[PDB]
């Protein structure tokens, strides 16, 4: 599936890092869109899609349907600039750039000269490749699989799982999870090329466990390091405890969560108090790609999420940690600038 906007069955606002996604439209100026573009909106100009900063694109026009003449376009993640192209009838689209590093392992005949730096079979070690991945990143490769079982399994009895394993064209791609909990996780992709068998093993880097959050846990030996700690086992029964993180930057590569030894109210981090004012987080932040992760250190309770990118509104939300009659408030304040 992918993005869609319908004008047969208002404003179609869209902006994101597009990983070979298909933007769907249903039916328009300037001229024929997806090859003509409303770049300078005020000067009302018509820049073609050829003279733009995107590396690889695919524009599609479908008339086979007997009810609508739909227009679609596929956007490769390869984009060295932040391109902004408009088209109304209003449908404005600004393609954002992927902030993460891209590791392309081209093991195919097609000379992929679009991205200069690339990795191939010489980097293998006895038909073995050990790739390290940072907190959030993207690994690409171009070959043909044996029985097409790749990049989901793991042999350390601990499967390395991703936010999205996208299989378009002949390119296998792995989207690194912003925070994976386990110490050892791996994934094997056994691909064949030139009658040789290549195994690509992926593992995460030593994750900087810098969780911009609060640790109310009564334990020292934690696999997770929060920027703020405390014990909740000591306070008054009627003492409200306030841990209020404030973040103010243009871009965001932050991990926000908490380790509560008691129960967590509401079901964070999906639900949060505004400040019974249970709102949904994704709508409150208004960002599509927000990853969610959870963990349990025995009886400790870890709940966190990962914000990556700009933020449209100065959002504030509050979660609660409750151990017996005692309480502990936490206020995240993500600024917009």
């Amino acid at each position, epitope marked *: 599936i992918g993005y869609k906007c319908n004008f047969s069955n208002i404003f179609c606002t869209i902006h994101s890092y597009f990983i070979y996604d298909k933007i769907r439209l249903i039916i328009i100026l300037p001229e024929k869109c997806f090859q003509k573009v409303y770049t300078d909106y005020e000067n009302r100009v018509e820049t073609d899609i050829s003279e733009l900063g995107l590396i690889e694109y695919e524009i599609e026009e479908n008339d086979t349907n007997p009810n609508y003449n739909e227009r679609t376009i596929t956007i490769s993640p390869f984009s060295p600039k932040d391109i902004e192209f408009f088209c109304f009838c209003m449908v404005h689209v600004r393609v954002l750039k992927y902030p993460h590093n891209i590791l392309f392992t081209n093991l195919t005949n097609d000379l992929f000269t679009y991205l200069p730096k690339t990795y191939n079979e010489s980097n293998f070690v006895s038909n073995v490749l050990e790739v390290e991945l940072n907190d959030g990143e993207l690994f690409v490769l171009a070959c043909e699989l044996i029985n097409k079982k790749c990049f989901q399994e793991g042999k350390e009895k601990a499967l390395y799982k991703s936010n999205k394993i996208i299989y378009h064209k002949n390119l296998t791609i792995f989207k690194a999870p912003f925070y994976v909990t386990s110490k050892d996780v791996n994934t094997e992709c056994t691909c064949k090329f030139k009658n040789n068998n290549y195994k690509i093993v992926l593992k995460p880097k030593y994750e900087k466990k810098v969780i911009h959050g609060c640790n109310f846990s009564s334990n020292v030996s934690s696999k997770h390091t929060f920027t703020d700690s405390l014990d909740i086992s000591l306070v008054d029964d009627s003492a409200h405890i306030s841990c209020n993180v404030h973040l103010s930057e243009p871009k965001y590569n932050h991990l926000v969560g908490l380790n509560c030894p008691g129960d967590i109210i509401p*079901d964070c981090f999906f*639900q949060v108090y505004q400040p019974s004012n249970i709102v949904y987080l994704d709508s409150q932040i208004n960002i599509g790609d927000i990853e969610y992760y959870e963990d349990a250190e025995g009886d400790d309770k870890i709940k966190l999420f990962g914000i990556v990118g700009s933020i449209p509104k100065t959002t504030s939300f509050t979660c609660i940690c*409750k151990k017996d*009659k005692k309480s502990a408030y936490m206020t995240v304040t993500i600024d917009s600038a």
Partner: antibody
Amino acid sequence: VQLVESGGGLLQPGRSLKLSCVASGFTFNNYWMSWIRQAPGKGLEWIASISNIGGTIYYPDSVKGRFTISRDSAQNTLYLQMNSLRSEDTATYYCTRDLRMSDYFDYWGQGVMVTVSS
Amino acid sequence: QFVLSQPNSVSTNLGSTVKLSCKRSTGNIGSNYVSWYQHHEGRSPTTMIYRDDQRPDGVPDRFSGSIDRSSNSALLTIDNVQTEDEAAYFCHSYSTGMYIFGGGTKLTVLG
């Protein structure tokens, strides 16, 4: 607020039944749920509790694995899949809405009866 | 981890002041919310007391709660016992994923 209970009947050891609990009125994804039962001539016993969405779930060790709580937001219903029933489970089962902040049950359901005998 | 000790049966006369205990075995009771519920036979259990002493809207002032640090027990006090008060009453304290209940003292109204 209203809690519609369903299911219940005669069952022999080892059989499995799923008790349903339809919600009404309140915002379903904003309140914890629980299942409480009472055997004839015995005190109240807690059986299962679920969070707002399903991030935290507790059971007492008595029904560990044997029972499995569930809740659906789209249809506003509560479930309690119980396996391998025994004579101890001969009781009437109730579903409750709880406030996790006040550690108490404000509203309760009718309570359908369950008979476990060979 | 503790046990809620409730007596077995109590009988009263119309218009009396009755106290119902709920003795916790271990741990200070002043750290876990107790909730007093009224269960009538052939009906669903209702709620009379929550968060130690506050009572829901629709519960007369006759019903009251009381935490005693000395005896480590809560007390549900029902003044001016009426005809319909012949029912079973229950206490419930929760802590860290453990929902503990009482014995269920059966209150009898002697008409």
